[PDB]
Amino acid sequence: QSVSERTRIKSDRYESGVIPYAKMGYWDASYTVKDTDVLALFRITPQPGVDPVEAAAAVAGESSTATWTVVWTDLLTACERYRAKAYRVDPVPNSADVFFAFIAYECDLFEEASLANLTASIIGNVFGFKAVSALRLEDMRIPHSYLXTFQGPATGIIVERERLNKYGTPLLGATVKPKLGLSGKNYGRVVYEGLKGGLDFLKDDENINSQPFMRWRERFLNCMEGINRASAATGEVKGSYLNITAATMEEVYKRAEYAKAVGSIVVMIDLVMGYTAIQSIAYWARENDMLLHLHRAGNSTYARQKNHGINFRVICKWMRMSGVDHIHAGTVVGKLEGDPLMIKGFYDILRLTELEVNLPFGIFFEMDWASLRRCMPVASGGIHCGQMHQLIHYLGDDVVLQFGGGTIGHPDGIQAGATANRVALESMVLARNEGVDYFDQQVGPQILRDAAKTCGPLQTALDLWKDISFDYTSTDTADFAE
Amino acid sequence: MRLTQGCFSFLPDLTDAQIEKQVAYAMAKGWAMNVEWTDDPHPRNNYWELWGLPLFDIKDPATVMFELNEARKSCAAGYIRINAFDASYGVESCVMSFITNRPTNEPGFYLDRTDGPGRQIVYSIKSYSVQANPEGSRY
Amino acid sequence: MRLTQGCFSFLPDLTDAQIEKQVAYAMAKGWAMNVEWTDDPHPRNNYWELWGLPLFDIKDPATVMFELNEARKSCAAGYIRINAFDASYGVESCVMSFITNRPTNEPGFYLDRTDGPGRQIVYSIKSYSVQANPEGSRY
Amino acid sequence: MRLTQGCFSFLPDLTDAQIEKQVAYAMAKGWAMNVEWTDDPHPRNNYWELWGLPLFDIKDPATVMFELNEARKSCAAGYIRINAFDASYGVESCVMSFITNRPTNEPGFYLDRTDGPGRQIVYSIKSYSVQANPEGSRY
Numbered sequence: 076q077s078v079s080e081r082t083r084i085k086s087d088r089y090e091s092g093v094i095p096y097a098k099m100g101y102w103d104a105s106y107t108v109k110d111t112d113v114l115a116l117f118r119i120t121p122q123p124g125v126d127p128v129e130a131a132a133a134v135a136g137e138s139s140t141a142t143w144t145v146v147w148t149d150l151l152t153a154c155e156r157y158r159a160k161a162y163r164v165d166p167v168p169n170s171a172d173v174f175f176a177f178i179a180y181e182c183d184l185f186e187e188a189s190l191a192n193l194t195a196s197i198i199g200n201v202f203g204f205k206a207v208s209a210l211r212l213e214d215m216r217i218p219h220s221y222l223x224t225f226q227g228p229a230t231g232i233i234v235e236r237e238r239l240n241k242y243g244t245p246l247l248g249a250t251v252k253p254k255l256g257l258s259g260k261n262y263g264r265v266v267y268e269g270l271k272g273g274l275d276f277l278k279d280d281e282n283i284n285s286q287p288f289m290r291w292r293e294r295f296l297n298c299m300e301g302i303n304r305a306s307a308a309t310g311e312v313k314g315s316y317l318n319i320t321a322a323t324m325e326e327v328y329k330r331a332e333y334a335k336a337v338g339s340i341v342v343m344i345d346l347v348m349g350y351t352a353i354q355s356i357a358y359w360a361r362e363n364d365m366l367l368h369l370h371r372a373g374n375s376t377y378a379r380q381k382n383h384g385i386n387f388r389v390i391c392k393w394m395r396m397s398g399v400d401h402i403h404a405g406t407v408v409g410k411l412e413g414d415p416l417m418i419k420g421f422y423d424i425l426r427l428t429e430l431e432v433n434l435p436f437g438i439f440f441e442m443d444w445a446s447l448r449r450c451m452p453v454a455s456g457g458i459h460c461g462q463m464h465q466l467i468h469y470l471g472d473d474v475v476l477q478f479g480g481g482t483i484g485h486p487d488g489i490q491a492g493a494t495a496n497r498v499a500l501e502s503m504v505l506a507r508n509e510g511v512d513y514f515d516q517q518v519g520p521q522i523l524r525d526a527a528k529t530c531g532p533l534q535t536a537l538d539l540w541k542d543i544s545f546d547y548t549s550t551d552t553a554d555f556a557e
Numbered sequence: 558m559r560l561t562q563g564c565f566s567f568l569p570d571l572t573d574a575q576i577e578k579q580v581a582y583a584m585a586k587g588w589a590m591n592v593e594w595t596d597d598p599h600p601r602n603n604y605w606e607l608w609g610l611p612l613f614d615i616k617d618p619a620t621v622m623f624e625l626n627e628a629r630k631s632c633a634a635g636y637i638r639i640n641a642f643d644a645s646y647g648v649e650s651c652v653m654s655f656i657t658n659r660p661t662n663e664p665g666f667y668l669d670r671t672d673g674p675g676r677q678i679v680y681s682i683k684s685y686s687v688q689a690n691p692e693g694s695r696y
Numbered sequence: 697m698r699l700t701q702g703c704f705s706f707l708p709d710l711t712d713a714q715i716e717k718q719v720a721y722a723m724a725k726g727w728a729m730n731v732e733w734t735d736d737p738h739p740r741n742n743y744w745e746l747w748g749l750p751l752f753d754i755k756d757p758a759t760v761m762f763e764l765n766e767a768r769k770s771c772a773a774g775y776i777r778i779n780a781f782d783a784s785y786g787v788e789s790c791v792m793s794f795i796t797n798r799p800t801n802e803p804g805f806y807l808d809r810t811d812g813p814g815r816q817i818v819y820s821i822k823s824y825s826v827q828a829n830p831e832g833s834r835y
Numbered sequence: 836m837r838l839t840q841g842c843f844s845f846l847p848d849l850t851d852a853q854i855e856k857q858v859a860y861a862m863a864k865g866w867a868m869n870v871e872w873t874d875d876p877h878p879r880n881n882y883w884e885l886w887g888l889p890l891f892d893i894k895d896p897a898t899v900m901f902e903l904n905e906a907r908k909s910c911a912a913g914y915i916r917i918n919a920f921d922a923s924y925g926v927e928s929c930v931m932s933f934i935t936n937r938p939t940n941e942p943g944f945y946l947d948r949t950d951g952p953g954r955q956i957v958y959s960i961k962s963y964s965v966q967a968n969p970e971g972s973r974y
């Protein structure tokens with residue numbers, strides 16, 4: 076009878092009704108990956124009774140073109156081409172209800188230079204799907220071709236060191252404390268003292284923006300005085316991460332422009348600003364000769380648990396793409412969650428020109444960085460100079476070691492605190508380069524106790540804190556040991 | 558004051574033998590060494606004076622050390638550093654830089670403040686050595 | 697006037713035999729045919745009315761012609777066009793549209809002029825059929 | 836065409852028994868009913884003409900139906916609707932509006948297209964009934 080009825084689609088695939096995502100062409104056991112594909116590795120915990128291939132295909136489809144029922148509108152497009160392929164599923168080591176699922180997405184699916192669009196597809200909906208009890212994005216292969224649309228770090232490790240005139244040892248910093256309550260005046264005091272005592276940097280706390288107790292312009296002006304006073308006293312380029320985090324993008328710029336205008340070398344942003352402001356202020360930082368330090372605030376809400384979320388290693392990739400110059404990536408031995416293996420992989424992702432597969436470090440995909448610049452990892456949170464031998468071994472050369480409490484907590488004052496940390500650092504590096512087995516539980520502590528014999532502030536820091544450790548079990552562990 | 562540029566400047570002035578070991582490290586890593594001189598200690602003095610060309614071909618620390626001491630004997634009073642340079646892709650930069658020599662009497666700097674708009678200040682870091690005398694007779 | 701949208705509208709109205717030959721060409725290339733109806737002849741009326749779905753799984757020009765003839769019987773006086781959709785990467789669009797039916801008498805358009813800044817005119821094209829009567833009763 | 840303003844216009848016209856029932860639901864929720872008339876069916880015609888004040892202090896549905904019938908008899912051909920108003924904090928607005936009367940024939944609208952900048956079109960929606968005749972004599 077009626078025209079709607081005579082022209083119904085009657086094929087197996089585009090007849091109306093629900094068919095499984097695997098039978099919609101989102102699964103292919105022998106897809107061959109192209110060098111232009113976005114690859115994603117997911118850790119999928121299917122619900123009781125849901126097939127492991129089905130859940131992998133479901134994730135492929137709802138992150139590319141599918142929906143829950145069949146649509147004739149597919150056929151207005153080159154739908155073979157746009158469909159993502161779940162193309163491999165292994166079971167997760169030592170578990171028969173959790174799976175590693177590899178999914179490949181066609182290059183053309185993604186807006187050029189838009190982390191917002193990349194994430195809209197890849198994390199948009201699928202983590203809240205009913206058929207899946209848990210889901211974690213473990214890794215991604217960002218293809219060269221997509222990477223070339225992005226800026227990468229504004230300054231990057233190499234140019235940063237050049238603007239600083241500091242090569243050979245890890246760089247040094249401290250978060251100003253207490254976190255909140257200090258007036259701009261006193262902030263400028265802490266910054267002057269710490270920088271004058273040996274620190275390359277200080278920083279605003281992540282949550283120091285502009286508050287009744289201290290409005291932002293006061294902090295910036297008073298810190299600049301402190302910074303330039305420090306550099307006049309030492310003959311070093313100095314700085315402090317002036318926090319430009321704000322409610323609106325107009326305010327963030329206003330703060331960035333103010334930082335620039337008064338001569339600041341560096342500014343910080345919080346991750347809670349979100350990806351679009353981050354990309355904006357990363358382009359801005361390139362164009363205005365500014366270091367951009369990303370504090371990763373909020374990360375561990377999705378990054379902490381192994382069964383579900385986004386692994387921080389993917390956040391590394393996305394943030395290096397967007398173009399931040401620094402990003403916090405963990406300490407191993409401090410107050411914040413850090414397994415040595417996972418931190419090492421984070422550091423490789425941020426620093427290397429390319430990645431080779433290394434499953435113990437959580438590097439699931441091999442990947443070229445497409446001459447995007449290298450992002451400076453930051454090691455921060457409850458660390459002290461008694462741990463310096465551990466810091467050097469675990470974290471390498473290109474890194475900023477931050478000691479907020481480990482500098483300011485020092486009983487002989489802030490300058491004493493800073494000096495203890497830099498002597499610590501320099502002697503440890505000096506020693507490594509000479510061939511000494513610095514990481515040995517005997518030698519390492521001894522190199523510092525020897526350095527302490529000619530540095531008063533160091534003896535004191537060793538005396539005060541050498542018991543201190545944060546010896547707890549990890550949540551984010553590897554599935555392959557070393 | 559002690560000029561704390563370079564990466565080992567919160568340690569004591571390095572001996573020839575301690576410098577040879579740092580040179581050894583750098584040569585075993587494939588890096589290129591060079592030696593440079595200045596008597597402008599300003600933090601923004603990017604370009605210190607080259608002492609010859611960088612030593613790319615060299616297979617023996619003693620050569621760097623021999624050049625260091627030739628530079629020591631020819632250059633006026635001031636600062637000498639040795640840099641290590643990594644031509645590798647994704648580095649292409651200095652990876653090590655430390656002071657080998659520093660004059661006995663470094664007065665340092667004063668901070669020079671010019672009034673900008675509102676409360677803003679225009680800072681210039683000024684060196685006593687440089688303002689009093691020309692290059693070659695500052696220390 | 698003659699509405700000269702479609703790719704064969706400077707030729708005489710196509711016979712059914714000529715239409716089928718163009719349908720047969722489009723379908724030999726693997727293209728999806730559809731039938732559409734309008735009584736708004738405006739140049740910028742992108743969306744004519746669908747006569748069912750595009751005929752995706754249809755191999756027979758005669759079936760396409762049947763839907764053309766059923767559209768012709770059921771639709772109010774107006775225009776009918778046939779399009780051919782190509783879903784291939786590189787195209788993903790219509791590649792052939794021509795008019796199969798046209799009204800006996802199309803009054804056409806007038807150009808409405810509104811004064812803009814300076815000498816600029818703001819132009820609107822007005823269909824006589826559309827302004828006078830609603831959809832379904834314009835011809 | 837049907838005029839699909841109001842929240843029940845995808846169902847057949849409401850019987851007096853059905854209208855009375857929706858009116859009862861609204862009145863049990865403590866909302867104020869009012870009756871409104873127009874012969875401008877335009878989607879942007881905010882203000883239909885008031886049929887009295889809203890019936891605020893009223894607790895019997897038949898009193899609303901009585902006013903509905905006086906409106907039906909007194910008012911010209913066109914549209915009538917009943918609205919329900921909630922004056923509670925955080926609402927302060929209509930929370931139910933539906934058509935109780937529509938004309939026997941509604942021609943509907945056309946889309947007037949004026950060329951803006953570039954490809955931009957400046958759109959205007961035009962009622963056939965409104966353009967042909969004044970308020971009071973359009974249907």
Ligand SMILES: O=C(O)[C@@](O)(COP(=O)(O)O)[C@H](O)[C@H](O)COP(=O)(O)O
Binds near residue numbers: 252453457
């Ligand atoms: O607020 C804090 O706790 C810190 O200022 C550390 O201060 P201390 O150095 O005084 O501990 C840093 O922001 C965190 O380490 C960030 O964590 P992560 O580095 O994991 O992003």
Ligand SMILES: [Mg+2]
Binds near residue numbers: 279280282
């Ligand atoms: Mg902090």
